[model samples]
Target: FDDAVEERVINEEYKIWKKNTPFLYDLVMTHALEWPSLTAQWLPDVTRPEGKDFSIHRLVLGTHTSDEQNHLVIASVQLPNDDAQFDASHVSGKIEIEIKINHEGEVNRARYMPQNPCIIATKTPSSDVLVFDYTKHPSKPDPSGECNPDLRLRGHQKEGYGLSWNPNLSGHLLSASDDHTICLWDISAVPKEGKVVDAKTIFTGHTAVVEDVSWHLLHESLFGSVADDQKLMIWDTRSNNTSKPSHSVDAHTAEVNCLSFNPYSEFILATGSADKTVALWDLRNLKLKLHSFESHKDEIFQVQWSPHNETILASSGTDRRLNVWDLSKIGEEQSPEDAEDGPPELLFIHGGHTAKISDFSWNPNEPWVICSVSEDNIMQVWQMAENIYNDE
Candidate 1:
C-alpha cells in the first residue's frame, strides 16, 4: 500500500493537533534544536561539512577581483600561430575584466571600461573573446597602470547577459541584455578620444529579459537568442529595415538560461533551461526537439557543447556541480518505444566548488582543460587526465 503513495503524497495530517505541540511526551521537537546547522544561514565562505570530493591539478590565487560574489571565469581560445600555451580570463565585477595575454600568473594587463560585463564571446577561431592581444601589454608596464577592456561596447540599460562576435564579420558584436533587447554593435567604428559606443541597431522582439545570444557559425547574417519569456528566436543582422525575428519557437517551459550553436554541425543547437533540462533542436524544424538531456536536477545556468567534440557537452547550475556528459552511446540506446533507459552517462562531476558554480569554459586547443569560477571566491584552472576518459 505504501507503494501507491508514489511520486505524490495523499496523506492527510491529523486534525487532533490543532495547535503547536506542548512540552509533554518524549517531544521529538526537543531534539530538533540539537541540529542547528540544519537552519544555518548559507554564507558564501562556509566550508563543505564533508570536505572536497574531487581532485584539482592546478590552482591559482585569483586577483582580488575574484573575492567578490559576482566574479566570472572563462578560458581563451589559443591565438593563431602563437607558441604560448596559457589561455584564461577572469572578470571581477568591478568596473573592468582581466585578460590573459601570454603566460599564466601575470596581471600586467588590466583596464576599467564596462562595470558589469558578465558575458563574453570571441570572433574567428583564434581571436581573444574580448579582443585582447599581448601586443597591447608590455614586458614592462607603467608603474601606475591598471588593465581594462581593449574596447568597450555600450548601450545596454542593464548588465549584459550574453555576448557574441560575428564569426564572418569579426568586427561586429551581438550583446543580449536584461534591458529587453538585443543590440548589434560595430566595433570597428570606434571613435578616437571617446570610450563610449552605441548600438548600430537594436533587435526588440523579446517580451522578457534576454538571457543569451549566439552567432550561427555557418550563417553570416543569422544569430540566436533565448530569454526569460521561454522563447528562442533567430534574427538576421544584415537587414537594416527589419526588427522582427526570422524564425521563432517556444524552447522551454521555464526561463531559457543559455543556448549555443553547434560549431561542427550545421543547423543544430543546444539550449539549457531553468527547468533543469538541456534540449537539442535543429533550425530546420523547431516544432520538435531532436533530444532532451535531463541530466541536471537544479536550474541549469549554463550549457555549451565542446568545440572539439560534437557528442560531448558540459553543464553547471545551482547544484554547485560541474557535469560533463558523453553522448557517443546515445543513439545505440534509443529505441522508438524505450528512449529513457540508457541516457548519457556522467563522465565526471567536478564538485570542487563549495558554492554554486558561476561559469566554466573548455580550451579550444585542449578540450579537457577547463577554467571554472565560483561565488565562494575560488577560481581554479584544471585539466582532466586523458587516462580517465581512455579507460572509460
Candidate 2:
C-alpha cells in the first residue's frame, strides 16, 4: 500500500504487462496456478486416495502482495483424469481468486510476466449457481475473454446481502445498500449511461440501512426489504413510488443479516439473523412463526436453498459451520439435528482466508459447484460430489 514503491516498481511492471497484452491474458486465466503448488514439505494428508493412483488433489493457497497485490489470476486448477481416476500428469479442478495491482508502477501491461493464483469453486453439475459479470472492467475483459460480460450486477455491493434478481423481470437486479437506498438496476438493457451497464431503480423507503431485500422468485413485481429500524417493507415493482409492502413480517430478536425465497414454491420466504436464527414467511400470514431456527452460535452470514430442491436449504453462520435444512419437514417441536442429512458432506475449506464469508454462490448450470468470497480478499469453491456421482 506504500505509494513510493507503487509509483516506481509496480507501475513500471504493469506498463510492460500491457504491451504484450494477449500473452498476459492467457498467462493469467488458463495457466493460473499457484507458484509452489504446495508449500514446505507438501502436506500429503490433505489428499484423498481414490483408486490405484487416483484422488481429488487440492491446492489451497491465497495471494500475498509483492510490490503490489499479486496481479495474477489464481483460479481453480483441476488435473487431467481419465474416468474417475486421477492422473498425476494432468489435473482436473478449478479455483477462482482475484488479483489486485498498483496503477502507479512503470508497468507495461504488455510485457508482463504473470504468476500463479489460488483457485475457487467445487466442481458440481447439479448444485447450481452461476455468477456471470463479476468481472466488471474499466478496460477489456481478462486475458481470456471467457469472463462473463454481464456487467449489470456483480462485485462488492454498494452494501448489504439481501440482493436478488426479480425472476419475473429478466435481467433486473436489486440490492439493499449502505448508501441508505435500495438500487434496482434494469440489467436487460446495455449501452447504459455513466458506465452503469443497467438502469437503476432506486427504492427509497428505509430511513436507515436496509439490510435485506428479497424478490419473489415466482412473482416478478412483489418483493420485500427490511432495515435496522426493525421495519420490513414490501413493495410492488410495477409501482415504484409506493410506500408499503404487499405484506410485512418483523419477528426477530436482532438484526437480520440474510434472506431469500423458495425457487420452486410460491410466496414462501426465509430470513436469518445475528441472533443465531432463521424465520420463514408466507405472504398471507406473517402473524405467527412459520418457522424459526436458532442453531447458530454467532452472526449468520448467509442462507441459500438449492434451486433443484427447494425443500433443502443451506445456512452458514459466524460459528464457521454450514447447515442445510429441509422445509418439507417443517414442524413446531423438531430439533435442529433432525432438519436434513446436513450440508451435503462438508468441505470445511474456510481455513485459507481469515475474513468472515461475504458471499457464497452455487453454479446454476453446474449444480455441484459451490463458491464463497470472503472479506479476506479470497474466494473459495466448496465442490460437492452428490451420491449420484463420485471421483472414485
Best by TM-score: 1
**TM-scores, each model vs. reference:** 0.63, 0.57
User: Candidate 2, residues 171-273: lDDT per residue as tens digits?
Assistant: 5666665555676665455535443242356677776667777677667787878776555666787774645555556746777766777777676777777
Model 1 segments beyond 4 Å from truth? Answer: 1-150, 189-193, 240-242, 331-342, 385-388
lDDT of 1 by residue, 122-224 (tens): 2211112233333455434334435343555555666554766676765577767777788777665563645456678889888898888888888879999
Residue 313 Cα positional deviation in candidate 1, in Å, after optimal superposition: 1.0
Going through the candidates in order, what is the number of backbone clashes in each? 5, 66
lDDT score, candidate 1, position 287: 90
Every candidate's lDDT: 0.55, 0.46
Best by the lDDT measure: 1
